[PDB]
């Protein structure tokens, strides 16, 4: 009664110290449900509260990327609130997204707190549907299937937005970036799955190279159907013998598999926001590193050519062209250190590119002021800056309060992906050792090495 | 109407703060659970209603 | 008066920690205002 | 900026994003109150 150890919420009952206390939940399906739903509330809370904070701080006439925004860029990329060139025409859609997430987080938090402290601690006595045993392989694949179906619907919501509810922001739209309705999504599997077999190295870039919204939307049509089909599959089947023999079947093992999965996705997202300027439009996120470096070469090409330079024939100090040179396969590219960035592609630059690379005739005659503007802007918003948000190279003096959203998003998600790989190793190794029965140490009376022949 | 709207949203903020403290306390309190359960229902229904009131009233000041 | 545990240690720790957070937060505020702000 | 009708709630909106951090801190207050048992 009046005893501190009288509950099962201590090391004495559970075998786990307070600093591993959430492991006490492994076999308490009800409270563990509470923990998960409450945690979902925290995610949704942040999405809502952070959007309202961003909107309250938002000056619509400054670029988003001058304002430390990462969520409003996500909403704008879906075509909400913006017009030609990414200009903000209406902030109310940002407000709605923020409010509805914040209100929804209250419902999730309510259910989480209920299940965590007031509801039934285990679900199995209460419901055969919601109860589960981690070692019940069929129940596990059924719950996986439910969530696969939910994820497929989610992918089809993006498609629905792109095709029937206003479209998406298209940085590549002919005549300038603009919101565009996608009517011909790419369904050809040779294109969609071709992305998955591209090398991740330079000039290829695996799926990070996706460069048009038709492929994006068609890809999500495929992922939607694949996930719904796989979900139906896993509700109607149980694991084959070869799978049963290959895997560890425990809650901690399943957690470890998902940690390895999320780590991989985190590293992928890091590269996506660093290199891709289609689903991360530079109008909202700022230029990529490659983009800003190319924009500097473009800027001084324009300036020096205006002064009378023949930029095609100008030999730089090394013997390579000061402004223009060849890639290792012959394409005409910008010179200087930005020779490394010749795989870059962006809508302000492509009008100057022909079958042989950069076209000297177009460079001499057809560079428009909006291209000079965009190159100057992007050169001066390169994703370089200090931890206290002093923009520029590390030797820059204080003045410009700037760190690119691309740098914030790349660094955070590398840090997170890395620790999640560590978590995968931790929990995968522990799940193996626990399934085999030696996660608490070596049995003194049955030490395996003592029964092995010496090595020499 | 602008003040009336501001009142309903203020009520929602205050009711929210009362629920944020009151619900976990009630859920983990031994005595008076019968009275607590009825109040949590009342607060929850009033909360939902105030969200709808603020949502509707939004379109008369924005 | 001198008996230990009249004021629960968990309250001592919580209030003391909040005090540390407040004072450190003040120092970070001062990095953006007044001397040392670059402004 | 928020729509002007909501402007009076600006200081509240400024502080809400940090609340998730408070939940991690709250776990330690709670654990201290049960003696880290």
């Amino acid at each position: 009664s009046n005893s501190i150890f009288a509950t099962n919420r201590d090391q004495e009952s559970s075998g786990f110290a307070w600093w591993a206390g959430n492991a006490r939940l492994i076999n308490l399906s009800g409270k563990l449900l509470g923990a998960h739903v409450a945690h979902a509330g925290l995610i949704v809370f942040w999405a809502g509260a952070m959007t309202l904070f961003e909107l309250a701080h938002f000056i619509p006439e400054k670029p988003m990327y001058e304002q430390g925004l990462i969520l409003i860029p996500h909403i704008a990329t879906l075509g909400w609130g913006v017009g030609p060139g990414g200009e903000v025409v209406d902030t109310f859609p940002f407000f709605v997204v923020g409010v509805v997430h914040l209100i929804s987080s209250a419902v999730l938090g309510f259910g989480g707190v209920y299940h965590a402290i007031r509801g039934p601690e285990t679900l199995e006595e209460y419901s055969s549907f919601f109860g589960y045993d981690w070692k019940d392989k069929n129940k596990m694949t059924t719950i996986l299937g439910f969530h696969l179906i939910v994820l497929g619907i989610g992918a089809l919501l993006l498609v629905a937005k792109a095709m029937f509810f206003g479209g998406l922001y298209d940085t590549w739209a002919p005549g300038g970036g603009d919101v565009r309705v996608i009517t011909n999504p790419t369904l050809d599997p040779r294109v969609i799955f071709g992305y998955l077999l591209k090398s991740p190295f330079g000039g290829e870039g695996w799926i990070v190279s996706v460069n048009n919204l038709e492929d994006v939307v068609g890809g999500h049509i495929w992922i939607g159907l694949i996930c719904i089909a796989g979900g139906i599959w896993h509700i109607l089947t149980t694991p084959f013998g070869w799978a049963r023999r290959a895997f560890i079947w425990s809650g901690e093992a399943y957690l470890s598999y998902s940690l390895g999965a999320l780590s991989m996705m985190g590293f992928i997202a890091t590269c996506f926001v660093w290199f891709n300027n289609t689903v991360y439009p530079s109008e909202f996120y700022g230029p990529t590193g490659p983009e800003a470096s190319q924009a500097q070469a473009m800027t001084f090409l324009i300036r020096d050519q205006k002064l009378g330079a023949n930029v095609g024939s100008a030999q730089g100090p090394t013997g390579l062209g000061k402004y223009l040179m060849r890639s290792p396969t012959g394409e005409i590219i910008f010179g200087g250190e930005t020779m490394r960035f010749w795989d870059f592609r962006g809508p302000w630059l492509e009008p100057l590119r022909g079958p042989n690379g950069l076209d000297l005739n177009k460079i001499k005659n057809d560079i428009q002021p909006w291209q000079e503007r965009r190159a100057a802007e992007y050169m001066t918003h390169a994703p370089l800056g200090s931890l206290n948000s002093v923009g520029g190279v590390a030797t820059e003096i204080n003045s410009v309060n700037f760190v690119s959203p691309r740098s914030w998003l790349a660094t955070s998600h590398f840090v997170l992906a890395f620790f999640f790989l560590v978590g995968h190793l931790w929990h995968a190794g522990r799940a193996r050792a626990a399934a085999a029965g030696f996660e608490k140490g070596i049995d003194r009376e049955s030490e395996p090495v003592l029964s092995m022949p010496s090595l020499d | 109407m602008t003040i009336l709207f501001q009142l309903a949203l203020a009520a929602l903020v205050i009711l929210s703060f009362v629920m944020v403290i009151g619900v976990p306390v009630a859920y983990a309190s031994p005595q008076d659970w019968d009275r607590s359960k009825q109040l949590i229902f009342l607060g929850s229904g009033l909360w939902i209603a105030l969200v709808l009131v603020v949502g509707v009233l939004n379109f008369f000041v924005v | 008066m001198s008996e230990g545990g009249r004021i629960p240690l968990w309250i001592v720790a919580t209030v003391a920690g909040m005090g540390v957070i407040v004072i450190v937060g003040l120092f970070f505020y001062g990095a953006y205002a007044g001397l040392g702000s670059s402004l | 900026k928020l729509p002007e009708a909501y402007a009076i709630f600006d200081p509240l909106v400024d502080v809400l994003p940090v609340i998730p951090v408070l939940f991690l801190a709250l776990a330690f207050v709670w654990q201290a109150a049960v003696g880290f048992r």
Partner: peptide, 30 residues
Amino acid sequence: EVIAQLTMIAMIGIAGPMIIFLLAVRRGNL
């Protein structure tokens, strides 16, 4: 704006420990 901000975060910040304290005195299910 700064007096309002500090008051909000003070009321929000006390709420958490206030829940623990109220349950501790009531000998609740901590």
